[PDB]
From a paper:
The 300 kDa heterotetrameric AP2 complex (α, β2, μ2, and σ2 subunits) is essential for CCV formation. Binding to PtdIns4,5P2 causes recruitment of AP2 to the plasma membrane, which induces a conformational change from its closed cytosolic form (Collins et al., 2002), resulting in activation of two key functions: binding of the two most common transmembrane protein endocytic cargo-sorting signals (YxxΦ and [ED]xxxLL) and binding to clathrin (Jackson et al., 2010, Kelly et al., 2008, Owen and Evans, 1998). The best characterized and most prominent site of phosphorylation in AP2 is T156 in the linker between the two domains of μ2 (Höning et al., 2005, Olusanya et al., 2001, Pauloin and Thurieau, 1993, Smythe and Ayscough, 2003). We show that this phosphorylation event starts during clathrin-coated pit (CCP) initiation and increases throughout CCP lifetime. μ2Thr156 phosphorylation favors a new, cargo-bound conformation of AP2 and simultaneously creates a binding platform for the endocytic NECAP proteins but without significantly altering AP2’s cargo affinity in vitro.
Recombinant T156-phosphorylated AP2 core (Pcore) with >95% stoichiometrically phosphorylated T156 was produced as in Höning et al., 2005. The structure did not differ from that of the unphosphorylated AP2 (core) (root-mean-square deviation [RMSD] of 0.56 Å over 1,717 residues). No electron density for the phosphorylated μ2 linker was visible, suggesting that it does not bind back onto the rest of the core and that it is statically and/or dynamically disordered. The phosphorylated μ2 linker is largely invisible, i.e., disordered and accessible in the open+ as well as in the closed Pcore structures and thus should be able to bind NECAP PHear domains in both conformations. “Pull-downs” and isothermal titration microcalorimetry (ITC) show that the PHear domain alone binds Pcore but not core in solution with a KD of ∼8 μM. In these experiments, the Pcore should be in its closed non-cargo-binding form (this work and (Jackson et al., 2010)). Additionally, our ITC data (Beacham et al., 2018) also suggest that by being able to bind closed P-AP2 in solution (Jackson et al., 2010), NECAPs could play a further, accessory role in CME by binding and stabilizing closed P-AP2 that has dissociated from a CCP membrane and so inhibit the P-AP2 from rebinding the membrane.
Residue numbers in the entry:
A (entry chain S): 1 to 142
B (entry chain B): 4 to 582
C (entry chain A): 9 to 608
D (entry chain M): 159 to 222, 240 to 255, 261 to 435
E (entry chain N): 1 to 141
Write the structure that this text describes.
Amino acid sequence: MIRFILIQNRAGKTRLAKWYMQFDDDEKQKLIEEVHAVVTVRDAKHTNFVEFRNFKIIYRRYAGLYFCICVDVNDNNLAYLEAIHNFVEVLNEYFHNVCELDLVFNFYKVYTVVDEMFLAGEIRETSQTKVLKQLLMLQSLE
Amino acid sequence: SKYFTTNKKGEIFELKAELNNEKKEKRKEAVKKVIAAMTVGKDVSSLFPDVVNCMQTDNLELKKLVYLYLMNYAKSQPDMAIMAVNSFVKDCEDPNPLIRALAVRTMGCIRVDKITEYLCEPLRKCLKDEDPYVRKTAAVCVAKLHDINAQMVEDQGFLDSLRDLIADSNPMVVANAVAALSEISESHPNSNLLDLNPQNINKLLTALNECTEWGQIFILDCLSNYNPKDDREAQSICERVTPRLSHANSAVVLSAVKVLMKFLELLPKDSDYYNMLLKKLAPPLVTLLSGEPEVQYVALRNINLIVQKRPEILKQEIKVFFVKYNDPIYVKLEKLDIMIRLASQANIAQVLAELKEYATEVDVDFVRKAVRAIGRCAIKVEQSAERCVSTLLDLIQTKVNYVVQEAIVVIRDIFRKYPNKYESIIATLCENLDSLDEPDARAAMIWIVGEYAERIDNADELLESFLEGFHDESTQVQLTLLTAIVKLFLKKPSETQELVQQVLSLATQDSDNPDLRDRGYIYWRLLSTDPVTAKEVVLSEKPLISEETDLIEPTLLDELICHIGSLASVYHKPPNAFV
Amino acid sequence: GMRGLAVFISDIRNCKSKEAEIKRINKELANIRSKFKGDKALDGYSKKKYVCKLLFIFLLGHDIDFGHMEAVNLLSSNRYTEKQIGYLFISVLVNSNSELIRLINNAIKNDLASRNPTFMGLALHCIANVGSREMAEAFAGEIPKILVAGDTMDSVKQSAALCLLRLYRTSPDLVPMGDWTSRVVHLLNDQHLGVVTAATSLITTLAQKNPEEFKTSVSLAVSRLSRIVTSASTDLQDYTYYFVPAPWLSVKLLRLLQCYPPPEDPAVRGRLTECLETILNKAQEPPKSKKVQHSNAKNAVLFEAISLIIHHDSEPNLLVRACNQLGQFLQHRETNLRYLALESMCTLASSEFSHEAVKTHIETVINALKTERDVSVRQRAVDLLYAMCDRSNAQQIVAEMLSYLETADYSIREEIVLKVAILAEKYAVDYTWYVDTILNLIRIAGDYVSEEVWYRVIQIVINRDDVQGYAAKTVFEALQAPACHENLVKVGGYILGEFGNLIAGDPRSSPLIQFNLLHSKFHLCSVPTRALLLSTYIKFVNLFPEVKATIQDVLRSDSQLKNADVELQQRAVEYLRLSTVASTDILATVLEEMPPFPER
Amino acid sequence: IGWRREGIKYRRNELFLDVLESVNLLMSPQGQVLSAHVSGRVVMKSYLSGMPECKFGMNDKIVISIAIDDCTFHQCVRLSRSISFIPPDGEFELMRYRTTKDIILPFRVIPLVREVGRTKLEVKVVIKSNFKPSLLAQKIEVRIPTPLNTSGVQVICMKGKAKYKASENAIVWKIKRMAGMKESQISAEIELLPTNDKKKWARPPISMNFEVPFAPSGLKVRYLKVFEPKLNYSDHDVIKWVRYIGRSGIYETRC
Amino acid sequence: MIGGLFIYNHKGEVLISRVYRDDIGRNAVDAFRVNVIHARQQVRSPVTNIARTSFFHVKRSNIWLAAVTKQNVNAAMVFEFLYKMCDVMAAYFGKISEENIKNNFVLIYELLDEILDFGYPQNSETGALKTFITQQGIKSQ
Ligand SMILES: O=P(O)(O)O[C@H]1[C@@H](OP(=O)(O)O)[C@@H](OP(=O)(O)O)[C@@H](OP(=O)(O)O)[C@@H](OP(=O)(O)O)[C@H]1OP(=O)(O)O
């Protein structure tokens, strides 16, 4: 299962964090640092997969933000690598060419998008079409 | 794909609005915010045209910010800074010298051959500029220019253009042309730097009087290179340098000392200058251990070589280098080395007291090096030996484990230096056989039973105590124990054979170490062949270890004296170690 | 949106100091209460927003010790945007206060009990995001009900399935295998694949403790997978991603099937084989898009299929086919595929039905390593060559390992040296090969070589001895590089001291040349090596009298005779005076040939 | 005060410092540090007349399920480089700490495991002591777990001694002593009765115990200066021992 | 001379830097990070030689000030230079800490171009620099 999902910038700063496991805030902070240290040190010659504590991390870099899913060792790497991209395509449609600050000012909507596509450590909805239609129905409400 | 690459919104677009906003106070804030982004690795390259247009300004603080931003892309990609070259040259016959220099320094920190063209002549004018902050920055710029590849021959209307500015009415200016000169000179053909020399020394060592903190040093360092001829030439050279208890201790001080020591090949005490100069040099060096901790380390690493060369200089000054508890480990250790390099026949007095101090402290590493130090005290100076061995015996009584073991090892080397002298102590030494974990110490005792086997009767049961766990044992100990027991036998046949079978049989038949196996055989083939010729070959009067421990080969030491300022002076290594 | 939020955030970015940040944060916290305490009650807009700011502050890393009641009242709003923020706040700041937990549970009670699927949605997610024991006790019995009921909407269904799954991971006892099971199973045949996708996750976790209860799924999972993978261009347009139909559900179905042994119904087995054969064929088809997303999606499916094939371990055609497809990935610019391919092959090399298939790609594994850049990938290439190494390979493997080492980085050296030694010991054809390997191992990377290993290579040159001359020359030609490291000087100097005579005949390698070569290492070596070289040196006095005085004056010297080290000075004196005192017969008796070692 | 009562006296003014650290590791079979942390405490045993003011000094290492970097001092400690206090008399805990960075891993465990079909498993494990050769580690144990369906086992090892314990499903290897910068090997041929019948062997990690005379965190004590104002003795009069004991905690290598 | 000047934070991250010679790339920054900042059981010294490259450093609270070359430089100078830079910085914004460094990126780049040309230590005592320096330092307490 997914243990957590992070979106972070080159600088180490977190832009989203969704946890599917019990951690205290100290720990959540430690994990957020640790992930930054591992992922900002790798050029494009490295794989998108790396073992991390007793789990592993799938990651991809879109400009200056790192999308990162931490998952169980036995989970499918490419499945998650592409889940990330499917998610980024949704984000990109939902914010009309998404940029780092979109995730800042609309941070609470970002969680809406996530819970659409991921719940309880598993992929929920993959269809870009359905997700956007729900999201825009959600936006029209009061 | 190009997700987050969006150009038509986000932080880039926002900052672009402010770089274009018509109020220069909001534009200053843009350029800072862009400088802050580069520094966090954000690709602000998109903005470069809008940030270059902020240079079309009266406001000083603004241009200043743009140059900073443009200086960041000099080193990052020198191609990104090829695109504001047309209005650099413009900005160096400017009103305000603050701007003039600011186009020269930024032109010379760029690294590709599109730079040769636009700069060959504007720099020609910044050296003829009537403001010295520009000639300070042109001088350093001429140096920057050589850096980029090729010799060039218009370059030999540039070397000479620099030599002009060594003669100048500003110690900041001249002292930098000097720095330029020696550096550019060390991509080496021989006869570079114009030997219009007798004159230009007078210009350097006047500049040095009025000079800045750091101007002096580029001077001092560029002198030493040259060998005077005869002889009293040397004299006043050295009578000018005298006031170096200057600003930038120790770079100033030590860059002097460098010169003040290549030129100590005089007919010395025909005139007591030699005695004048050497009285001088003690005080300033001493002062550098008040400076700061890092600066010290360097000082001491030079002092170390200096003390080996001209030992007279600091002979009287040992208390200078006594250890402060709060000194970093590395100042402690170099302090210690030098404390023993100066341990006169007379100052062992407190020097020994000053090491009983150290071996009782908590820094376990430094403690150990301190009781070694007492060792090489007993060894350097003969008359301390008796008192060193006393101190050592005291430290061993404390029962502090690490101190004991270090001491035993040191006591072994003392017995070797002063044989047949400290023998009653052996009995008191074996008392502590209970608590010797470390290989070295075990090997020392073992060697000490040695060697003095015929003195002591229990000696067998002692040496036998180790045969139980001959393995588990350091191959150094194994070796030492092999040799130890063939000694025992070579003075007590019948008596020993009880055991000596075991030990040759364990090196020969049981040991995987081929070097150890060798040694068992070699001894087996001596003993079990010739009962007297063996005694000759082993128990011979070995020569006395003379204190070679810390000591540099005298030729190499002169190489390192001809370097005293530098890196090689800290590593105590020639520059062949890094080409 | 909420302007006051956007301002608070813009003020926080414009801040030019962590001081000023913290000031602008304390300012907002005062303002927020204030207004929470204030006599004038607030509009929904304002609660909603101020809660939202509190969440923001929290996410910057600062503490928040109020707001919780205000977040809870938003739950009871009939305004979505208000509920949403209340639900988000409690999902992100979980507080202990059992007064609030009871309220939260009421809100969830209502929202669930509403028939509004947006509100049902928020409710189910809150539960699922928080998973509190108390939440389980309130709702664990209701979730299965909502999941199955004929009337609840697909999106709710999805959200309820994964909700239930979490309730089952944190509170299994509140999730007995009731009566809903088969109706859960039937979800596998839903039209909405998002729903199918949700259920598959649930069922997978449930079928790991409860295989018999869900063993019905196998058949329906095979049916779905096969309809899925054979679907046309214009099928499942929603769930097609870069021309690949339903990659994530495919993976998932394939994974559910790894909960069970092969389907027991022949026809089913067959549909499954057809299925996998198909997946395996698609890997052989060229990409429909040059975008890496297409092949990553396709391969995700492939690899999960490969996993299923391994785990069943029952179709040898498929295992072989899987090997070969893996092997073609080894020659790919995609570091990701190279990596996964080595990974899966390593598994595959421990099953009989595939071991020999894997051996087949030895050459490709080696060529991939020989030119790899990612260290993790090199690492795993080397692990595969160890996995696939036997008698038929040993030598090809060892030779390339050695070859690779000559120009290797450092990252990888240590591991390979260890491996080379180990495979050498196990698979040595003859003594000579072994010695040829070890000596060369030591020449190239002796800094990593064990003592046990160099002890052995010397110790071996006795018993089967006819290698001595080879050893002697090899050690020699090695030593005569300016490069040259310590354990070489050790084995080098031990061997030449003992069998240097067999190469002293050549004038390219005379006693004097041998000696000086050795001595040009001496003063650079650690003291035990010099102890060893000192023994070499006197053996030289014995074998070659042509050079006994060059040697004696290196022994008579100060740096040997007055040596700080006890062993160095002991030997230099013992040996100096051996070459001086006694006979020549004695000298030759004492430093003869040196007997051979015993056995194990 | 209130932790140190008035008018204490001893003929012989001593103090002892025990640095006691526990090192934890998880590591991949390729040697990637997946997680690692040190838990420590300095224990001071002080017999000092009067009310001594103490100034303590150490190196850079400590800064002041998921391990967090932390440091906690005794109630007596005052902060400003250096720590200063009037210590309680006899034994107490001066400080407690945890570090996660730049840990010195006393051993590298390198596993070589080889599933020959479903009937034989070949296991080799090499351990490298990764510290100064002059220092010695003791009470070494390597514990190599075996699968449940293990028919039997034959084990060879050149250093120490080892043996298979079936109640614990484990090969247990022991080494009384081992110096730094050495290497050691064990080999094992394990025989397998094939149940399974689903599920590859889910492989638990190899674990070690050991003890070393240094702080795996790198902590070094540099000074401890005693200044008693009223009384007769000075820092020069105070006898001082330091000990470092580094123990293994959960020190694991996946195979 | 001074061929590379980097300032790290308590985790070996390059907070801000300026190269002055192309003779040193990334390979420099890493060596110093790996062997000095994240050093294990090594004999620390203010000067280290790895990859045939020399490294000077001082430490301020939690900040690493480094200085770097492949030349045979006046060692003594570097440290003298470095203590004055710290004399300069602290007189523009007080405590020399990761935060205060971070607040004053614009300013610090500016002291650097001024205090050091192509690596040569220049007139760098506070009062002289009030002319050549445009920025003020964001002091916090
Ligand atoms: O930012 P201010 O100028 O102080 O205005 C704030 C406030 O914004 P914040 O509390 O978030 O800073 C309100 O919300 P927004 O609508 O700007 O989001 C609000 O204005 P509304 O009442 O229109 O919501 C309110 O009251 P006021 O209307 O009196 O300006 C209040 O100002 P006070 O602190 O003076 O109440």
